[PDB]
Amino acid sequence: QDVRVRVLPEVRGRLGGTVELPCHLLPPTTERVSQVTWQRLDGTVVAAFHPSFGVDFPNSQFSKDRLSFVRARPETNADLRDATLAFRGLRVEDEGNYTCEFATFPNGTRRGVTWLRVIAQPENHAEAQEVTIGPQSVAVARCVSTGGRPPARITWISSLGGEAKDTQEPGIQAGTVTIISRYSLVPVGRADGVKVTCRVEHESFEEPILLPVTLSVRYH
Amino acid sequence: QDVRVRVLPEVRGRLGGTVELPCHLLPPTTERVSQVTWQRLDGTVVAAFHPSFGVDFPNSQFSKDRLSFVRARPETNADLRDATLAFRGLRVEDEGNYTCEFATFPNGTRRGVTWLRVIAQPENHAEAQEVTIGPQSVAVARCVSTGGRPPARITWISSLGGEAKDTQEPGIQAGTVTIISRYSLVPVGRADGVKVTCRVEHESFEEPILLPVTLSVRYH
């Protein structure tokens, strides 16, 4: 894990979206570059670049349709020190640790490693459930952050001191998860009409999203 | 530590002598080779080979005077899969773990690692010390394996049950060690003329070397 190879430790990309993973051999340019290879941790080579032999993306799983080098030079940069790797149509399966390796000469190989995270932005909905008075604590409201990656975090902003209950469950999409949160309390008459807000946090949002809902109690 | 790179785990060479360290990328030949580099563990590159840029031995310590590739081809083998590295004028300082690395394309780098040991063959001498009768246990014989690497192992084959004492000490040559072994016993009259043998074992010898000596006691 060499300082003269510059990369970013972490990099995030939207499910089914695109990311560039940057990688550079930092100058001074005091060594020739022999070839560049992007490997996964398993060892599996993802993309490879060679000044004579050209480019290759030998894994059927990370094919040329999705992977590409950003390198822009007109077929002939006096040296290929920028090794930046673009992904498209991101898969959950691409979440991984990628390793950018420069075979230099006569200096040996230098590498840098970047963690690619695939985020999925969930879909959010809340509602009140209409309830009758009674001593049993029932769900008076629910909030659901569907198909998040990673799992979203729901909390309840309410003036009444009702217990929250939540649970996980698999998302529709491979490696997404839906979070279900139920707001329960003993239904009391003064509660009718009171706004109770669902507060859902997730990587993909600038900040917590708020889904306000108004409670509904029997016999106003 | 890849199976498709063939090397030898261990390799021994005489101080101030020569060794070849062999290294091959095993066929089938299903990948192009980009460049070959021999690194020490520290990382320090010892020798490097590149099909276009040529050869280099960039470390002042392992210079071209001593290092060389055995590779024989007339400047143009269709591929340079044999990466065998010759050393000469071996130094104690070269004892190390060397790593043979093939930058392949598009396949990544494969490597193999060989431990290079520098042996020094010691010089051996033994003698009896002449002694007078007396209750005090004195050295009646000594044996010295001078300037060994690694340290030699001396033992005594004798019919009399005398205690052995030995000690280390630095050798003349950097990273050699002299072993001194004294054969002591209470000098008894029947012992005169009795052969007592020095038995010294060391890597460099086919087997244990034997230095026989005849005891010398006062008043036969």
Ligand SMILES: *[C@@H]1O[C@H](CO[C@@H]2O[C@@H](C)[C@@H](O)[C@@H](O)[C@@H]2O)[C@@H](O[C@@H]2O[C@H](CO)[C@@H](O[C@@H]3O[C@H](CO)[C@@H](O)[C@H](O)[C@@H]3O)[C@H](O)[C@H]2NC(C)=O)[C@H](O)[C@H]1NC(C)=O
């Ligand atoms: C470098 O990678 C190449 C190609 O790798 C192939 O595809 C990638 C997406 C990955 O899935 C790789 O795992 C995959 O191999 C390798 O070439 C292949 O080498 C192997 C031998 O190591 C060949 O298998 C042999 O097949 C023959 C008969 O066809 C048998 O007789 C052998 O016993 C053996 O099973 C394979 O056919 C070959 N592929 C091609 C297109 O030639 C290469 O081995 C690898 N090299 C290194 C050093 O990693």
Ligand SMILES: *[C@@H]1O[C@H](CO[C@@H]2O[C@@H](C)[C@@H](O)[C@@H](O)[C@@H]2O)[C@@H](O[C@@H]2O[C@H](CO)[C@@H](O[C@@H]3O[C@H](CO)[C@@H](O)[C@H](O)[C@@H]3O)[C@H](O)[C@H]2NC(C)=O)[C@H](O)[C@H]1NC(C)=O
């Ligand atoms: C991708 O790689 C990153 C970072 O690199 C990590 O370090 C490397 C040098 C290797 O040794 C890798 O094995 C290692 O993953 C990973 O981030 C790290 O993930 C590990 C899980 O394997 C986390 O370890 C935890 O550490 C805490 C203490 O803080 C313990 O309580 C746990 O038991 C657990 O061991 C670690 O927190 C995390 N580090 C950072 C900075 O996020 C990553 O997991 C791996 N993932 C992917 C998707 O590629």
Ligand SMILES: *[C@@H]1O[C@H](CO[C@@H]2O[C@@H](C)[C@@H](O)[C@@H](O)[C@@H]2O)[C@@H](O[C@@H]2O[C@H](CO)[C@@H](O[C@@H]3O[C@H](CO)[C@@H](O)[C@H](O)[C@@H]3O)[C@H](O)[C@H]2NC(C)=O)[C@H](O)[C@H]1NC(C)=O
């Ligand atoms: C690959 O190795 C080359 C040459 O390495 C040199 O000799 C070997 C036997 C080893 O002892 C190496 O450690 C040694 O560097 C490296 O080239 C050298 O790069 C450094 C910068 O990393 C240069 O030092 C700079 O010097 C200038 C002024 O001269 C300062 O302004 C800088 O602040 C810095 O100190 C050094 O001069 C340069 N040598 C040559 C001949 O150009 C190279 O860095 C290295 N590359 C990698 C990726 O490892």
Ligand SMILES: *[C@@H]1O[C@H](CO[C@@H]2O[C@@H](C)[C@@H](O)[C@@H](O)[C@@H]2O)[C@@H](O[C@@H]2O[C@H](CO)[C@@H](O[C@@H]3O[C@H](CO)[C@@H](O)[C@H](O)[C@@H]3O)[C@H](O)[C@H]2NC(C)=O)[C@H](O)[C@H]1NC(C)=O
């Ligand atoms: C050169 O390298 C060899 C072999 O490779 C070794 O394994 C590598 C994968 C790395 O992890 C290296 O760190 C490691 O050296 C070395 O041979 C081994 O040396 C180590 C000392 O570092 C020995 O370890 C001992 O193990 C015993 C238990 O059996 C313990 O009681 C000791 O505490 C000690 O840790 C090990 O015996 C030895 N292995 C063999 C097969 O000989 C070598 O030391 C290193 N030396 C040189 C000159 O390059």
